[PDB]
mmCIF file of C-alpha atoms in Angstrom:
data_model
loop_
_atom_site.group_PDB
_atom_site.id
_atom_site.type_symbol
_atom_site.label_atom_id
_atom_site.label_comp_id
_atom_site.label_asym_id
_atom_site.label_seq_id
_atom_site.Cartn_x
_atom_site.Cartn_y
_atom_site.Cartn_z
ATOM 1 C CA UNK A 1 106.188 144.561 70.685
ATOM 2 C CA UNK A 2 105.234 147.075 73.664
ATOM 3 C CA UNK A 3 106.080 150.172 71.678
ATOM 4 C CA UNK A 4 106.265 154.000 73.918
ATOM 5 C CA UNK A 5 103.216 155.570 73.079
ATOM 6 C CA UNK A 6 102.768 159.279 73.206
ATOM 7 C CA UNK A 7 99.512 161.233 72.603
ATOM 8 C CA UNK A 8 99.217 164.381 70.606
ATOM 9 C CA UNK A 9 98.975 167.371 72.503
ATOM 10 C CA UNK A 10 98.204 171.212 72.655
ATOM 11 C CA UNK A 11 100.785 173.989 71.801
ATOM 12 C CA UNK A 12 102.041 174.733 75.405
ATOM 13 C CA UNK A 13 99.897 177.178 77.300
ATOM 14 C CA UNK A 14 102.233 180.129 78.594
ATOM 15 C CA UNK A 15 100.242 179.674 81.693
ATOM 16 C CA UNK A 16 101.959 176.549 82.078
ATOM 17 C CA UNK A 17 105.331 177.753 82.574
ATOM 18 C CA UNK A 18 107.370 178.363 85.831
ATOM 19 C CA UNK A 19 110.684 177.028 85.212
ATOM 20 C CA UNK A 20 111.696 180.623 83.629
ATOM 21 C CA UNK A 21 111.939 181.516 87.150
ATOM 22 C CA UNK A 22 114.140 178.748 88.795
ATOM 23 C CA UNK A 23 116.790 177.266 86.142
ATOM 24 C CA UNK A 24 119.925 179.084 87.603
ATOM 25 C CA UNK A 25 121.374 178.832 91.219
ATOM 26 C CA UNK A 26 121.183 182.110 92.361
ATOM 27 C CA UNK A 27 117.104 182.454 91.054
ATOM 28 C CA UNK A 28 116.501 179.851 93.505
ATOM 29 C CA UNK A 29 117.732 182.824 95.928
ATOM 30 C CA UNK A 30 115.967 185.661 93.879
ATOM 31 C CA UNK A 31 112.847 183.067 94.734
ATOM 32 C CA UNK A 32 113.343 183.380 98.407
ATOM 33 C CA UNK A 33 110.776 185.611 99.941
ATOM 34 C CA UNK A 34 113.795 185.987 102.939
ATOM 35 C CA UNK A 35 117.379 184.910 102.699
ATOM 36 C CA UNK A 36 119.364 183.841 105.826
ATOM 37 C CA UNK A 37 121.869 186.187 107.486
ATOM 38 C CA UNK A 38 123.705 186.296 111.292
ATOM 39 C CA UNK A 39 122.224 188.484 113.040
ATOM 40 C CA UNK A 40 118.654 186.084 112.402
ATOM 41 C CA UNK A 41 120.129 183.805 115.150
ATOM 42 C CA UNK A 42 119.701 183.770 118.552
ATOM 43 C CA UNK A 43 121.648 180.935 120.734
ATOM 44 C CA UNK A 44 120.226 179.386 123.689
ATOM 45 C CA UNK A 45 122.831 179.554 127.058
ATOM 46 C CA UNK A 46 121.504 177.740 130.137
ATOM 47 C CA UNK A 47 123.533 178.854 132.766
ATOM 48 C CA UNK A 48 124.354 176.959 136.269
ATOM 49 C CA UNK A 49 125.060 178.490 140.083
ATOM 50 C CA UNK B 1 105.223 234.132 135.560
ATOM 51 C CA UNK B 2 104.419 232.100 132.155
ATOM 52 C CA UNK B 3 105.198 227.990 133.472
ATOM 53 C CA UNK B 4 105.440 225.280 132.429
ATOM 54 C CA UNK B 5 101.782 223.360 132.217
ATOM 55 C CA UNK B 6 101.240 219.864 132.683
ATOM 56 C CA UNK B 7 97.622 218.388 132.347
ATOM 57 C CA UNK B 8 96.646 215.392 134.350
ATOM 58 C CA UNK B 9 96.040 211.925 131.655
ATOM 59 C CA UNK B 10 95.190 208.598 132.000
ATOM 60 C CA UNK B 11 97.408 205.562 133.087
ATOM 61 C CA UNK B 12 99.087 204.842 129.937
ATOM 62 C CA UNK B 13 97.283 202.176 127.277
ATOM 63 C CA UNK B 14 99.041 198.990 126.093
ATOM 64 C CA UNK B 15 97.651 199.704 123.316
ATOM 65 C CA UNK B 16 100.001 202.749 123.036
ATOM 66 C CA UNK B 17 103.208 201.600 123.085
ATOM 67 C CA UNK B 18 105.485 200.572 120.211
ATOM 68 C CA UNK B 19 108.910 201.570 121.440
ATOM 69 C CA UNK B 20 109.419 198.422 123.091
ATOM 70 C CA UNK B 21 110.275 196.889 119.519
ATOM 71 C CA UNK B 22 112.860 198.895 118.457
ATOM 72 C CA UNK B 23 115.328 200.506 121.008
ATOM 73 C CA UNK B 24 118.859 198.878 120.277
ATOM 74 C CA UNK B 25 120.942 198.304 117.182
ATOM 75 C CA UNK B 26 120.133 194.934 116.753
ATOM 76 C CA UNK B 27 115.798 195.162 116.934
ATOM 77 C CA UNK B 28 115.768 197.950 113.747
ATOM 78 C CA UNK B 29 116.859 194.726 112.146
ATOM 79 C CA UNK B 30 114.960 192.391 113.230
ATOM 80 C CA UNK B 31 112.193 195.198 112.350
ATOM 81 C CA UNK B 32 112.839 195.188 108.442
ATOM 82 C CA UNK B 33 110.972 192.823 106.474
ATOM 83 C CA UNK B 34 113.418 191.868 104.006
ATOM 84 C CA UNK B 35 117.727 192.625 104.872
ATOM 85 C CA UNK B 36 119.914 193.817 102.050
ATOM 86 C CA UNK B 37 122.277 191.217 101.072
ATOM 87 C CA UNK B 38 124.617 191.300 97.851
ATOM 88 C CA UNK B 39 123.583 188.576 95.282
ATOM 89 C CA UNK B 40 120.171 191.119 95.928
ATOM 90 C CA UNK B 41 122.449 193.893 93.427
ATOM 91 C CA UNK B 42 122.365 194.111 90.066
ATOM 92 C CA UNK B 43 125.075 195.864 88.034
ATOM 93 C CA UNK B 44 124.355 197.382 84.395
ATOM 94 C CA UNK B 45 127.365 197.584 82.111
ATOM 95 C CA UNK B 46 127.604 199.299 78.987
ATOM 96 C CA UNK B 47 129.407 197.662 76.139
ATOM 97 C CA UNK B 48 130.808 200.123 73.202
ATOM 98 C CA UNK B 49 131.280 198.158 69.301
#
């Protein structure tokens, strides 16, 4: 039989860890170097004679 | 009589002038690198046993 292998490996490397920062739904706005708000828009009007 | 003196200068510099980027409401906004926005607060609480 084709059995899953899986290879020894390493204690985890802190260094190797992001998802701390990005588990949660408001971290993914806490990761946002800007957040959209309202007055950030600016519609275009093309106006006829 | 003590006047009022007024010395002759140069054409004015492009260089010089800033004020064109924030003279309504609306620019001193668009002037801030980050806007403060409410899932930006954090509130400590203090729990008694």
């Amino acid at each position: 039989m084709h059995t899953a292998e899986f290879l020894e490996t390493e204690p985890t490397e802190i260094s190797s860890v992001l998802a701390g920062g990005y588990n949660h739904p408001l971290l993914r706005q806490w990761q946002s170097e800007r957040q959209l708000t309202k007055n950030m828009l600016i519609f275009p009007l093309f106006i006829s004679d």
